[PDB]
């Protein structure tokens, strides 16, 4: 039948792709960086403990100034903090308390959030009356909102449990592009430094590179064994790292079109909830279900430090654009700044 | 100057802290419930008796606030979004007395999930009347789908309703002991299961939830003092 031919032909192309990737693998990253000096023990300390949310935290996002940040809690509240002083600036009540993601517009004028309501809500922080009111409600997803990131003040890319990603035109309420091809819930997305491309991780154990303007998947990366929960671009935009429920983080090269390194340990048995790079990319930070965060030497795959200050599972983390600090959120309802 | 900026930031923080204090009063004084269905269970009719992905229904029992949430427009794959409800007072699981076996696998997943281990489950074995007529007719049997029914006997702790024939009493009690086997196998004092033989229209449903929640909160209090 034609179904077998299409299934048979697809298997033929997968073998071809695997052969091409196998030909490019003449030397591993580990042996290329074998002669470089180790990073050494890096010890970080909790410099700030942000309190005030009533329930578990699900997402946080640094502002482009490296000082302000927004946090989303399932109590139905969005809080914008000033990390330097610990003072709270905005407490935005939410129509639905089941929020799962939040984003800080790069201009600092808007913040977004979504969740089980399947709606992406944008809030105008600079309203003429000083109060924070919902500006636009983006509907059209048939599943919960998992992640979102502003491209500019009028464009935002989202990921949904409906297995698709969408690009929206704010102030019209319509999505101008739909990124289909994932089979499981899309869990995280990351914008490239140039914003021309972005990568998404789904519950099908695969990550996809997308073309924002054209709207098609350019590459697909495999190697993880379970759901991908977090994804982050390498600083130069030629690689990215992912965290999975299989208790491992992996580094993928865009030009080599294959995996380069696996960060794992025998004592690490829980899933990874978040991932982020340092300013230079030498360090890879990952949050874990076991309440801890591990610092990895990206070049040598060695573990260099641990952040252990949370009493419940770490749900999100991020590194300031200046690279001066890293923030971690937990279901324990607290946010911590490490330096 | 800067001292004026810091003063303004403290006043802004102070005002927000005031609203959050009152916000914490309402949140702590309201019990959140997740309404879950195994399919055609009749929970919609029960809800009628008191893109949108979540539905809400608020009701009051003896001056006590209750907040119940029903999932809509969400895919059948629950392993991700189910984690959101790890802190609700209880999960209401409505089941129509091989959908029954399917409902059993979903209950076992919920009962044994690492995030949901401390969460209690109120179980509504719904549509007792429908099971009665089917049992009485005998055209369909539970033996085909559950061979252990042949060797099952009505429990000595059974309290059949007045006028209930022995055949229907065994059927509904056999189904109840299917869920109880899963619940007792695990959950070492962390969470509990409350079965109920219910009809989709009986007015006593909201009273049952109120009584089950009170026991759950009582047990939580006793466990914080290490008494139970």
């Amino acid at each position: 039948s034609e179904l077998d031919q299409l299934r048979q032909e697809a298997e033929q192309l997968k073998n071809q792709i695997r052969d091409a990737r196998k030909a490019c693998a003449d030397a591993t990253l580990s042996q290329i960086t074998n002669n470089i000096d180790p990073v050494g023990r890096i010890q970080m300390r909790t410099r700030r403990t942000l309190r005030g949310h009533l329930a578990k935290i699900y997402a946080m996002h640094w502002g482009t100034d490296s000082r302000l940040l927004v946090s989303a809690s399932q109590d139905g509240k969005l809080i914008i903090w000033d990390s330097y002083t610990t003072n709270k600036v905005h407490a935005i009540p939410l129509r639905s308390s089941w929020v799962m993601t939040c984003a800080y517009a790069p201009s600092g004028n808007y913040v977004a959030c979504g969740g089980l309501d399947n709606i992406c809500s944008i809030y105008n922080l600079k309203t003429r009356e000083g109060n924070v009111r919902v500006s636009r409600e983006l509907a059209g997803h048939t599943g919960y909102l998992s992640c979102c990131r502003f491209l500019d003040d009028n464009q935002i890319v989202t990921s949904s449990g409906d297995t698709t990603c969408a690009l929206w035109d704010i102030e019209t309420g319509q999505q101008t592009t739909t990124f289909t091809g994932h089979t499981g819930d899309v869990m995280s997305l990351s914008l490239a430094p140039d914003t021309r491309l972005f990568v998404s991780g789904a519950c099908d154990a695969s990550a996809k590179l997308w073309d924002v303007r054209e709207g098609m998947c350019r590459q697909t990366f495999t190697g993880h064994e379970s759901d991908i929960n977090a994804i982050c671009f390498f600083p130069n935009g030629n690689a990215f790292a992912t965290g999975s429920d299989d208790a491992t983080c992996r580094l993928f090269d865009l030009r080599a079109d294959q995996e380069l390194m696996t960060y794992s340990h025998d004592n690490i048995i829980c899933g990874i909830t978040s991932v982020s790079f340092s300013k230079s990319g030498r360090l890879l930070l990952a949050g874990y279900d076991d309440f801890n965060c591990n610092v990895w030497d990206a070049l040598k795959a060695d573990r260099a430090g641990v952040l252990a200050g949370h009493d419940n599972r770490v749900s999100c983390l991020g590194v300031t654009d200046d690279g001066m600090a890293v923030a971690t959120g937990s279901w324990d309802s607290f946010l911590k700044i490490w330096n | 100057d800067q001292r004026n900026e810091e003063k303004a930031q403290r006043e802004a923080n102070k005002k927000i802290e005031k609203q959050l204090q009152k916000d914490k009063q309402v949140y702590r004084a309201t019990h959140r419930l997740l309404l879950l269905g195994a399919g055609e269970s009749g929970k919609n009719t029960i809800v009628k008796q008191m893109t949108s992905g979540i539905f809400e229904t608020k009701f009051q029992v003896d001056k006590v606030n209750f907040h119940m949430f029903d999932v809509g427009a969400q895919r059948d794959e629950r392993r991700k979004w189910i984690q959101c409800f790890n802190d609700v007072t209880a999960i209401i699981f409505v089941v129509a007395s091989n959908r029954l076996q399917a409902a059993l696998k979903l209950f076992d997943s919920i009962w044994n999930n690492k995030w949901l281990r401390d969460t209690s489950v109120i179980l509504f074995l719904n549509k007792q009347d429908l099971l009665a007529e089917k049992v009485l007719a005998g055209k369909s049997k539970i033996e085909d789908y559950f061979p252990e029914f042949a060797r099952y006997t009505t429990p000595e702790d059974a309290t059949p309703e007045p006028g209930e024939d022995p055949r229907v009493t065994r059927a509904k009690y056999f189904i109840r002991d299917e869920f109880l086997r899963i619940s007792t196998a695990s959950g070492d004092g962390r969470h509990y299961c409350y079965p109920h033989f219910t009809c989709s229209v009986d007015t006593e449903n909201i009273r049952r939830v109120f009584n089950d929640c009170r026991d759950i909160i009582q047990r939580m209090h006793l466990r914080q003092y290490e008494l139970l």
């Epitope: 297995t163 154990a205 429920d245 899933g271 | 794959e77 392993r79 044994n112 690492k114």
Partner: nanobody, 128 residues
């Protein structure tokens, strides 16, 4: 790449038997729970059986409790289902399904209409 490829099955007379196999690759086979599911013509997906990581814990659906037998060989990354006394109601497509996460006690979504960690099932037809 996570891959599951079921083999075996086909036309069998009533009262016969079959031996289904599932070849797994792309993941550590020894730390995942496994399941067999089937989809009868004009019906939804139905759970059949499952086996723990070490094979100690086994369970079956009522209709096949004494007839089917599930086994696994961790060293070879293969899953088995021995089907005996097959009757016409058993005709369906049988899929080899892996639980979503390793080292886990629960097993969610294995019977959903679309599930990533499931192979392309093998047709099993019981007829005269």
């Amino acid at each position: 790449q996570v891959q599951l490829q079921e083999s075996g099955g086909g036309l069998v007379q009533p009262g016969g038997s079959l031996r289904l196999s599932c070849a797994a690759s792309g993941f550590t086979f020894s730390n995942y729970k496994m399941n067999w599911v089937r989809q009868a013509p004009g019906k939804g997906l139905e759970w059949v059986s499952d086996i723990s990581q070490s094979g100690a814990s086994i369970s079956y659906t009522g209709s096949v409790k004494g007839r089917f037998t599930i086994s696994r060989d961790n060293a070879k990354n293969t899953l088995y289902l021995q089907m005996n006394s097959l009757k016409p109601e058993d005709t369906a497509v049988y899929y080899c399904a892996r639980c979503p996460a390793p080292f886990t006690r629960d097993c969610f979504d294995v019977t959903s209409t679309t599930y990533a960690y499931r192979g392309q099932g093998t047709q099993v037809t019981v007829s005269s």
